[PDB]
Amino acid sequence: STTLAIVRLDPGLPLPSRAHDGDAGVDLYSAEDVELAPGRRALVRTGVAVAVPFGMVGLVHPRSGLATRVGLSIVNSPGTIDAGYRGEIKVALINLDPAAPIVVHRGDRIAQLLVQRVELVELVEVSSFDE
Amino acid sequence: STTLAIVRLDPGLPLPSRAHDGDAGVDLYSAEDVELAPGRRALVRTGVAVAVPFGMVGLVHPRSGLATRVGLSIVNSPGTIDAGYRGEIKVALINLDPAAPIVVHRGDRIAQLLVQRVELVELVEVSSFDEAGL
Amino acid sequence: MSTTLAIVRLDPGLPLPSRAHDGDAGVDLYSAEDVELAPGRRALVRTGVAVAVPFGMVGLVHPRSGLATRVGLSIVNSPGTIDAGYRGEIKVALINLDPAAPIVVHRGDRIAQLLVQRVELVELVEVSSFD
Amino acid sequence: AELPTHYGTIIKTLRKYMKLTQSKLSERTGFSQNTISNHENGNRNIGVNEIEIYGKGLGIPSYILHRISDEFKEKGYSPTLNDFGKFDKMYSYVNKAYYNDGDIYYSSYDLYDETIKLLELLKESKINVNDIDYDYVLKLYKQILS
Amino acid sequence: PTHYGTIIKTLRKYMKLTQSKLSERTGQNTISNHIYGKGLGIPSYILHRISDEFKEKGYSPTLNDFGKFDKMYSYVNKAYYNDGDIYYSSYDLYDETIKLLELLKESKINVNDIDYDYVLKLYKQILS
Amino acid sequence: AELPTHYGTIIKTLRKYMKLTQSKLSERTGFSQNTISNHENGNRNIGVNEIEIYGKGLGIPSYILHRISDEFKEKGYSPTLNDFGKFDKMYSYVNKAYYNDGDIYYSSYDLYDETIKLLELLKESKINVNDIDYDYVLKLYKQILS
């Protein structure tokens, strides 16, 4: 029922879309062809920008297929999209395999975006824990 | 008092359990012995399936102890368990120590399982954010 | 009204974690110590803070991207979990995922952000098979 | 922004395969028979949020709509659209493997591409998708995920 | 599942409360050869943990001396929730408790005649 | 806990720059005129607790106050406090870049340090922060993160 407004900076890729009814996330495509050598990393454009509602957060998780099969992970997992943010969503990929380079193709699904409520807690300093 | 149905696909292992009342996680266990050399990963069974309620997500976290002390991590951390998934929970373990091998035995704690609400939002393209809000 | 998060400063030389903009998911944690991580090396790093995560919720320690993208500075156990009962110092398990370049972390530097989130304290009910 | 007319042909073909009248697809999407007809013929191009509404109405995930499109953009036609009955049967298994089997759920790259591969193999062994059961698909499905 | 009867009973016998004492709580009564919690009498985590020791070794040394355990667990818990050295370095508080009782018994030291600080020192050592 | 006396000089200077009376500053923080009065003079030291409350009252992040107090301890005064209008102009450019540009959001270490570094470059270049536009700042920011 909640609508995440999204801008397609790259009109050559489809709107991302929740593939199955209860799935927690929606895959983000690569907008660029990259090769990652073992242990090397890359910030990769996804061709979209989103408006996470106030009181929620965008969360970029790596895909279990790419990671087991090939050792493709995310350096800053889970990547935080703040509600204030309105730039292109990018993914900090890293090749955590010791020998095989990974090739990403513009079009490939290379992460999934979750959205969750987040307690925007008020910090209050105290002297000692009476709790 | 929300309920998570869980099947012991492997009856020799304990049932996952909440240690204290406020504790976010329940420890999962390896069903198999794995030796990971430095840098190598392995997909290890936990011998459970779960029924994550619709409107929720299951999350597999690495545990601080093994992480700090021997460099044991999860490649796809955190593991996303969809509400439609009814197969065995598996954990993509990687050894991130540069020298020491890690040896996981059958029955060791290898991950925390968290259950959280997720916004099942529908993605609508807008001309620009300026027109539709900020 | 908003949810309070009580915070102690075991080290008063550091400034208090603060929420920069109204809807920012996390508050940045500062390092309480100076540390050199060579490539592939890790360290458990004090932050000079303790928190009282409300019961029903969980502290989550995420990596700051930027340190992640530019020098490959990650967290081993990401996302680090603070339980509601924990009252000891937040320590961050930092690791150097770059293969060549040592990373130097100065006391007072922003090394991670703390999100607070609601967590379902579910009842586990064993069953033979499913519905 | 508008999708390039071939989505018209894709929806019409899939609507017919889905045993749906313009009435049923109208009473489900909110679009009038007029707008569906102008989409399906090429008069009006299908907006980017319209393809999402169509998918839901048809009962097909929009991803397949986008990958069928991609077939056209390369070859000039869609083998998958042409033979969408063979593909729908295989995908419903592939879909059931993924959501119910540890060996698939964690090792899968693309549900679309993996359904292609499993047809090629049933084809090149001279077997019918209509002949085989879930267990035969799964066995072969686990192989191609190495 | 009959092994739990010994456990539920032995916990009662140890808990210093009659059948009637626990037989008034959460519903001789409905107790035959006798988990919903005995009014949370003991966290069900521990009842299930003692059960798990039956399926590995025929008996439970933990139940065999629940007196010494309950003391040590309460310490191991204080260290866990209050000490940064313990929280990030622990593997399993139940097991770590059992290990500390093990070492104390071979040093011929009693749990009830020891303070937190002593146990905390030992604890830090077994974790390193 | 009690802070050094230069904090009172920081609050005085920043009250006057934000164009607030002692009375107005009182209404916001909750401190009485007398409290603020003595704090601004050095009759009393500001409680470690209180500096957060002052930051919200002025509408300046508490960590800015801390970083300005660190300058005091080091150089004996604060060049950031003496040129606070310039830091403020640049910091709003720096802040807007962080929230609207992907070459910034994913590369920033410290908005304060980056704010100070853009300022230092403009001084070398003999350029005033009011005689440039956001587009110019962004192009210069991208350099220092690259």
Numbering used by the authors:
A (entry chain III): 2 to 132
B (entry chain HHH): 2 to 135
C (entry chain JJJ): 1 to 131
D (entry chain EEE), F (entry chain FFF): 8 to 153
E (entry chain GGG): 11 to 37, 40 to 46, 60 to 153
Could you give the paper's own sentences about this structure?
The mDut-StlN-ter complex was crystallized in the space group P21, and the crystal asymmetric unit contains two mDut trimers and six StlN-ter monomers, forming two mDut-StlN-ter complexes with a 1:1 stoichiometry in which each mDut trimer interacts with three independent StlN-ter protomers. In the mDut-StlN-ter structure, the two independent complexes are largely identical with a root mean square deviation (RMSD) of 1.1 Å for the superimposition of 642 Cα atoms corresponding to the Dut trimer and the three StlN-ter protomers. In both complexes, clear and traceable electron density is present for the entire Dut protomers, except for the eight C-terminal residues corresponding to the catalytic P-loop motif V, which covers the active center of the enzyme once the nucleotide has been bound. In the complex, the Dut active center is occupied by the StlN-ter molecule, forcing the projection of this P-loop into the solvent. Interestingly, a detailed view of this structural comparison shows that the trimer of mDut in complex with Stl is more similar to the nucleotide-bound form than the apo form. The differences are mainly concentrated in the unique and short α helix (mDut residues 65 to 70) from the catalytic motif III. In the Apo mDut, this helix is distorted, losing its helical topology, whereas in the nucleotide- and Stl-bound forms it folds as identical α helices. This observation indicates that Stl recognizes the Dut active center in its competent conformation for nucleotide binding, in agreement with the capacity of Stl to inhibit the enzymatic activity of Dut. In contrast, the absence of motif VI is exploited in the complex with mDut where Y116 presents, in the different Stl subunits, rotameric conformations alternative to that observed in the ϕ11Dut and hDut complexes. As in phage and human complexes, Y116 from some Stl protomers interacts with mDut D109 and R110, but in other protomers, the rotamer is identical to that observed in the Stl free form, losing these interactions and forming new ones with L67 and R70 in motif II.
